[PDB]
Amino acid sequence: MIIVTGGAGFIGSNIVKALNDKGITDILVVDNLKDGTKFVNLVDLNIADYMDKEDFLIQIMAGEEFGDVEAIFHEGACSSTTEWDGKYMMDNNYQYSKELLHYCLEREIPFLYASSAATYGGRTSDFIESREYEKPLNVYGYSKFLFDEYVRQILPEANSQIVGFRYFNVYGPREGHKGSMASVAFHLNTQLNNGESPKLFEGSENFKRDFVYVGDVADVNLWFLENGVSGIFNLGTGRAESFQAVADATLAYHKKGQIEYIPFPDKLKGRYQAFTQADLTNLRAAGYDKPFKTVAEGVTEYMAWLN
Amino acid sequence: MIIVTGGAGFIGSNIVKALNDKGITDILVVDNLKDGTKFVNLVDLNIADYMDKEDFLIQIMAGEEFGDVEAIFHEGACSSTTEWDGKYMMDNNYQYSKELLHYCLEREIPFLYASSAATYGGRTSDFIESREYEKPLNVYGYSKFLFDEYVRQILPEANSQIVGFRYFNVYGPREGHKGSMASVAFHLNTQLNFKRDFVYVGDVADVNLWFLENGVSGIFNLGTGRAESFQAVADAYQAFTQADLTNLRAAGYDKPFKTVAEGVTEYMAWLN
Amino acid sequence: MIIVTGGAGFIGSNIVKALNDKGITDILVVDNLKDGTKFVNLVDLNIADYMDKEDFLIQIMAGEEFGDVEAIFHEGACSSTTEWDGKYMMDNNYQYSKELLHYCLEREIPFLYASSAATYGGRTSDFIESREYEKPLNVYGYSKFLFDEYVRQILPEANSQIVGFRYFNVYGPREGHKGSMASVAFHLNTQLNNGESPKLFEGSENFKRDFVYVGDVADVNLWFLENGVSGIFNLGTGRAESFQAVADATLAYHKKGQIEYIPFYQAFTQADLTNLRAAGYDKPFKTVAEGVTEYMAWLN
Amino acid sequence: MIIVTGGAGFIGSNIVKALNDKGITDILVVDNLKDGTKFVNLVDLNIADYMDKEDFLIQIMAGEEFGDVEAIFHEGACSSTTEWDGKYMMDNNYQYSKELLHYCLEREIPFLYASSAATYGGRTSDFIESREYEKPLNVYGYSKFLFDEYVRQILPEANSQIVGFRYFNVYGPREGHKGSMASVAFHLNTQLNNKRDFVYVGDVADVNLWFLENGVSGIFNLGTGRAESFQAVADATYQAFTQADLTNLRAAGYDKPFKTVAEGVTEYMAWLN
Amino acid sequence: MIIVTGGAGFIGSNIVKALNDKGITDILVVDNLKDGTKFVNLVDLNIADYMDKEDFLIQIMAGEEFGDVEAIFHEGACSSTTEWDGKYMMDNNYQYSKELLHYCLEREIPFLYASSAATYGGRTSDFIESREYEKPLNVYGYSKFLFDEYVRQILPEANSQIVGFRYFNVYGPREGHKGSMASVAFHLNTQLNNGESPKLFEGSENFKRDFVYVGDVADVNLWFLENGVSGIFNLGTGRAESFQAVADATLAYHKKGQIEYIPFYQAFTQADLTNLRAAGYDKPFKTVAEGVTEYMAWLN
Ligand SMILES: NC(=O)c1ccc[n+]([C@@H]2O[C@H](COP(=O)([O-])OP(=O)(O)OC[C@H]3O[C@@H](n4cnc5c(N)ncnc54)[C@H](OP(=O)(O)O)[C@@H]3O)[C@@H](O)[C@H]2O)c1
Ligand SMILES: NC(=O)c1ccc[n+]([C@@H]2O[C@H](COP(=O)([O-])OP(=O)(O)OC[C@H]3O[C@@H](n4cnc5c(N)ncnc54)[C@H](OP(=O)(O)O)[C@@H]3O)[C@@H](O)[C@H]2O)c1
Ligand SMILES: NC(=O)c1ccc[n+]([C@@H]2O[C@H](COP(=O)([O-])OP(=O)(O)OC[C@H]3O[C@@H](n4cnc5c(N)ncnc54)[C@H](OP(=O)(O)O)[C@@H]3O)[C@@H](O)[C@H]2O)c1
Ligand SMILES: NC(=O)c1ccc[n+]([C@@H]2O[C@H](COP(=O)([O-])OP(=O)(O)OC[C@H]3O[C@@H](n4cnc5c(N)ncnc54)[C@H](OP(=O)(O)O)[C@@H]3O)[C@@H](O)[C@H]2O)c1
Ligand SMILES: NC(=O)c1ccc[n+]([C@@H]2O[C@H](COP(=O)([O-])OP(=O)(O)OC[C@H]3O[C@@H](n4cnc5c(N)ncnc54)[C@H](OP(=O)(O)O)[C@@H]3O)[C@@H](O)[C@H]2O)c1
Ligand SMILES: Nc1ncnc2c1ncn2[C@@H]1O[C@H](COP(=O)(O)OP(=O)(O)O[C@H]2O[C@H](CO)[C@@H](O)[C@H](O)[C@H]2O)[C@@H](O)[C@H]1O
Ligand SMILES: Nc1ncnc2c1ncn2[C@@H]1O[C@H](COP(=O)(O)OP(=O)(O)O[C@H]2O[C@H](CO)[C@@H](O)[C@H](O)[C@H]2O)[C@@H](O)[C@H]1O
């Protein structure tokens, strides 16, 4: 079987779907279903079992076996860039990850986890997977940063696969539960569908990010499992587009819409990345030979799905 | 002895009553009496013992023996479609049932549990017990659906009886504690004081004991096979439901089900 | 040593008093003193030790020994007919009693507990100790009923004493902490002393109950311990008297007052003592007039 | 070392001070410092260590050793007469004390604890250390009473010292943290700055050390033996009437005199400045 | 491996930085990150691992091994002078410290901890490291004082290094999380940057403290680790400067600003460095002018 933590979440459920598409249905999903609405991410999919993240951690630490485990896609984490409880952050993200990494290392089970482009911090170019280029602006980013550092210590003598993917701005199907953390594209679609005005922060024409479609994120994940390469790789399209571009593509699909500019949130001031662009040199060097959908291509496919 | 989980609840207490009618009183009721008003479902009945759902799970997991257990009717669950705490939902419903299932499998104790027509979701026809017809609209429905999928993985090599009943719109005596989740017929009665497959609890209890006596395994729809309107109930989200009884009849259960008109008048003649 | 659970409570402290009255002082009282005012039921008494109901259960369940235990009078329970948390009710009353029962059975220690006439629910007549006559109206009544059914299954092969007493409307010393649940005699006394009108519900004549004096309740308990008989027995006088008769006896001692009848339920209870007498207990029971005058003397 | 429970409190800190005055500083103070202001009662004193009352009980019950313990002055307790949670009261006072008593009995460590005149309830005369004179008016008094009864059962066959002191109305230094529960003399002093048996703490501390040095066991009233009015306390700056009967105290051998209200209060007013 | 408790805090993160500057990156930081904004004190540094203070205590007390531990810099504590829950203070500060001291003593791991000048209380002169000079004014000062007294009992027969540093008025990079508890220099800088007025208490011209730069605090810490000397030492510059001088240096840097003396302890502090120099620590300490200007260049 394959274990997908964060399996009821955005990226996790898309990995489960990609596995289903490849004829794999022996899957254990580990998540936190407190917010029961997340179940829709799993309804049309096929899995073998479900376990809560707290029970799973207890069993992992107790050395329990879950069967013939072929890989663990660790997507589970608190992903809110605006969550400031650092005790919880380091516990749920950092410590939880180390616990799983060791469990897999002992049993030589491939470990593929989720890192974040938030690790780069206030950068304007050179988004390269190296400590000198890393300086997070929030605890969330720090929890991700510190685990990558921990993995870099472990890599030299690991006897099984360990891969971390620094996702950039992921968007696409199955993120409806994310609320305020859902992608801007999702937000714009609900605003337009509720008759409200589509909104963007003041400064969005100069605010650029590397938006990647989830479908591509799932594909990179499965490719790495099939190919066994280890390391920490940036996962983005390699091209930064403005938030305005995301809006343009979405408002084109809707045939209506006039963007309203909202004042920049105070809680984000000093904690925000105004520009991100993945450097795919290492990803390509690892052998990943597939293309990435553009914002225009990915956003129109997503909007068709949302409606 | 026979263990009935959810025994102080609607369907469970009706199963205890049906057992009492067949001269069986050596029954262990497992439930959650936080809402003490449910004790009335049990007052006029005869059971051997009562245990809280949390204590029972601790003992089940500890591998404790409860005596000469002849069967477990697992009716206990959070049956609210409006309950959105999925952590609790998956634990109380899904995980709890797996724990019980394994306990019974190891000891070859017949396991008869409660599924739900909510597994079908927004469906308009073809309510057949197969994964392609299932797509719940809420976590409650999901916890039920996922356990059915788990049982389907277990069925091929099980050495003892496993039966799940997909109840449709059950109504009848002993549901007063359900509040907003009580049947529309109950609501109308207390108020005065879309088509669904409405089934009388009496028939539900009968199907349960019939399967225990016949030992057949599987997942079966439990409804009348006839969809009637809420208006019909009054005269006496899934928008339309109607059980496909092909598998139930094929298992050998050929007995008829009371209509809304027959069941609702017998029910009012009880509530009053 | 004798263990009295509910010992800081109404009936339990009266059992401690009765034991003291014969010179017995080696007593372990188990209760819940969260409501500290209950300490008065114990100040004038003589006991060996005190333990909270939670710690006691933990020790019982762990199989600890408490010394030379000659009996356990289990009076401890939640007695509120208005308490609807059935999870607590079934745990504190039903489950706790089973735990104690088993502990005593394993060690052959006499077990005398408290049942309740609430098991009869809305019964009007024929208050006999048999399942056909039982149908409680609330969870409290149900927790008591079910434990009696459990004891009935255990009785046939028990090797030591098991006795349950279905108390009716008990009244007498040490029920002051019960508030609105205290006896009408207690309420009337408070009123007369506060200078208010002794109050009775409209048409209180014709409203009858089997009012029993706690002193007689305590005596039945000690008699059964001394005689070793097992079973479930009604504990009442066998005579139903009206609330009016209780008021009459109250003013007859107080030498004052004029009853005021307030506005607006069992209109009748009377214990059938056939089984109690058949078990061997034959002492008389104080009448309302006798018991109430004695009670008032203590209250004042 | 000497263990003083209630050591950051009124009477306890005074016992620590008395020990300091005799060259003893190897002291373990056990208290509850939730009210951090109680630290002042110990700033100017010399102790060896501090431990929270909860941790101490856990170690006592686990049978841990604390070093070479020569005595335990158990002053720690909830002393609020207006505190009605009897579950807490019986646990914190009654049960806690039994736990300590047994620990000391098994190791033959002298056990000197605090009782209370509240055990006499609303009494008017004959304050004598015997059960017939005791009838507390609140759970506080009851938790104290019942532990004295427990000690009386234990006394006949104890192989080490057990002493309980029935303190009457104590007043003096280190009670500032007590708030409304502080002595009337303390209250009057605060205000100006903006019949019962009153005993000075200094005397209370002295009696405590005397018994440890002399090893006598028993339960003894600790008061001056004379009842003075609150008016008297005022001039110098529910139990109605209290007056300790010192027959048993003198009989045990403690002959020393007690400061009167006028003497004790003027000395106290002096320290409070 | 070196363990730095309080590592995400002010002094602790500066010690981690000083370790990094000397090539040491194998560091375990133990802290409480509930206030997640403290992460910034660590983003630019290099450590080996992070652990919460509660989990660390459980492991310490369980006797767990953390690897090859060559020293523990115990800077973690509740540093609020206005915190009055003494149960917590004594637990988190005093007890937690004893727990760590014993763990280190058993394994002979050098233990360097943080004391406080608050142990002197309201003292005006003679800030010497001896009991006669100590008399704290709050529980925080008392928890620090009592641990120093405990260490003094332990010192005579210790077989490994134990050093405590009584820090005076520390100021410098990485204290932004402290809020109201941060240094006046920090405060003045945030105000000059909020376009508004720098506030100083009226009479600041005569409010003097031994202000010490964190950089020098970290240097003392590493020097003692390198030299293995034990004891309790004052950590200040030995010179008392006014709050006005602090302000002068700030405004000199900002090339602007006008001081508004707002309405409104320890009006004088000055470390006696006799024992510090006698231990062998001979380096000079930055003055307020030197330290404050360097601090401004960093804050901007
Ligand atoms: N644009 C993006 O989505 C993006 C960009 C960069 C990095 N990432 C990383 O990608 C991963 C998945 O992100 P997502 O967008 O798919 O998030 P998501 O929708 O929030 O899914 C993560 C799921 O995991 C649960 N969870 C939290 N901690 C867990 C744990 N320790 N073990 C198992 N489940 C846990 C969460 O529930 P609770 O949180 O309620 O417990 C949530 O349902 C995370 O590690 C995130 O940091 C995402
Ligand atoms: N129309 C219907 O009644 C209908 C339709 C479809 C499916 N079903 C299924 O039929 C079964 C019985 O339904 P019902 O209408 O009779 O409901 P019900 O009256 O609510 O009875 C279920 C009882 O079990 C308790 N319980 C909950 N979780 C339990 C557990 N894990 N173990 C033991 N007891 C537990 C409940 O208390 P708490 O929930 O308060 O803990 C409640 O008293 C359920 O499994 C339900 O999902 C019913
Ligand atoms: N007329 C009557 O008095 C009457 C009539 C019928 C039946 N009974 C039965 O007679 C018994 C005594 O009644 P009462 O009037 O004397 O009541 P009571 O005044 O309420 O005394 C019972 C005492 O026991 C405590 N307690 C509760 N659960 C306990 C447990 N599991 N173990 C030990 N102590 C426990 C109660 O405290 P908390 O409840 O605060 O925990 C209370 O202080 C009860 O079992 C009652 O059901 C009495
Ligand atoms: N006039 C009098 O002062 C008087 C008269 C009669 C009897 N007594 C008795 O004399 C003793 C000391 O009285 P006091 O006036 O000096 O009181 P106090 O100022 O309140 O000192 C007692 C201290 O002990 C603490 N404590 C409570 N339970 C404890 C336990 N189980 N172990 C250790 N410490 C505990 C208290 O904290 P918390 O209470 O906040 O937990 C408090 O700081 C008490 O036993 C009291 O009942 C005093
Ligand atoms: N001016 C000064 O800086 C000064 C003057 C005199 C003495 N000191 C002492 O210097 C040391 C460092 O002070 P600081 O100014 O750098 O303070 P700080 O920034 O508050 O750093 C202390 C850090 O440790 C945490 N912590 C608290 N208790 C802990 C424990 N038991 N184990 C691990 N971490 C713990 C605190 O979090 P929580 O408290 O939120 O849990 C905080 O993040 C402290 O011991 C302080 O008492 C400092
Ligand atoms: N220019 C703009 N105009 C309008 N709205 C804007 C905006 N920029 C941001 N927002 C909105 O406000 C939130 C603030 O997001 P952040 O910039 O802090 O993080 P990020 O966009 O990298 O989020 C992402 O990264 C984290 C993990 O790295 C995921 O958890 C999250 O779902 C993902 O969108 C966003 O989730 C978005 O919904
Ligand atoms: N005539 C009157 N005049 C003035 N005040 C009155 C009154 N009758 C009752 N009250 C007061 O108001 C309340 C009415 O309650 P119930 O009579 O139903 O309770 P009770 O405890 O007497 O009997 C319960 O307990 C006994 C024995 O356990 C059962 O026999 C019985 O059916 C059950 O209701 C009582 O608490 C009482 O103090």
Curated annotation (Swiss-Prot), chain B:
Q: Which reactions fall under this protein's catalytic activity?
A: ADP-D-glycero-beta-D-manno-heptose = ADP-L-glycero-beta-D-manno-heptose
Q: Which family does it belong to?
A: Belongs to the NAD(P)-dependent epimerase/dehydratase family. HldD subfamily.
Q: What does the record's miscellaneous section state? A: Essential for E.coli viability at elevated temperatures. Insertional inactivation of the gene by the Tn5 transposon results in E.coli being unable to form colonies at temperatures above 43 degrees Celsius.
- Give the protein's recorded name: ADP-L-glycero-D-manno-heptose-6-epimerase
Modes of activity regulation: Completely inhibited by ADP and ADP-glucose, and partially inhibited by ATP and NADH.
**What Gene3D superfamilies does the entry give?**
NAD(P)-binding Rossmann-like Domain (3.40.50.720), UDP-galactose 4-epimerase, domain 1 (3.90.25.10)
- Domain of life per record: Bacteria
Question: What's said on domains?
Answer: Contains a large N-terminal NADP-binding domain associated with a modified Rossman fold, and a smaller C-terminal substrate-binding domain.
Q: Pathway, according to UniProt?
A: Nucleotide-sugar biosynthesis; ADP-L-glycero-beta-D-manno-heptose biosynthesis; ADP-L-glycero-beta-D-manno-heptose from D-glycero-beta-D-manno-heptose 7-phosphate: step 4/4; Bacterial outer membrane biogenesis; LPS core biosynthesis
The cofactor remark states: Binds 1 NADP(+) per subunit. NAD(+) can substitute for NADP(+), but enzymatic activity is reduced.
The gene designation is hldD
What's this chain's function?
A: Catalyzes the interconversion between ADP-D-glycero-beta-D-manno-heptose and ADP-L-glycero-beta-D-manno-heptose via an epimerization at carbon 6 of the heptose.
Q: Which cofactor does it need?
A: NADP(+); NAD(+)
Keyword NADP among UniProt keywords:
yes
Residue sites binding NADP(+) per the record = 10-11, 31-32, 38, 53, 75-79, 92, 144, 170, 178
Reported temperature dependence: Optimum temperature is 42 degrees Celsius.
Impact when changing residue 197 to N = Activity similar to that of the wild-type
Swiss-Prot record, chain D:
State the HAMAP family in the record: Heptose_epimerase
The UniProt record lists the EC number as 5.1.3.20
Q: Which organism is it from?
A: Escherichia coli (strain K12)
- CC cofactor: NADP(+); NAD(+)
Official protein name in the record:
ADP-L-glycero-D-manno-heptose-6-epimerase
The answer to whether the entry has keyword Coiled coil is: no
Residues annotated as catalytic: 140, 178
Miscellaneous section: Essential for E.coli viability at elevated temperatures. Insertional inactivation of the gene by the Tn5 transposon results in E.coli being unable to form colonies at temperatures above 43 degrees Celsius.
| Source species taxonomy | Bacteria, Pseudomonadati, Pseudomonadota, Gammaproteobacteria, Enterobacterales
User: What's its top-level EC category?
Assistant: isomerase
Q: Which NCBIfam families match?
A: heptose_epim (TIGR02197), PRK11150.1 (NF008360)
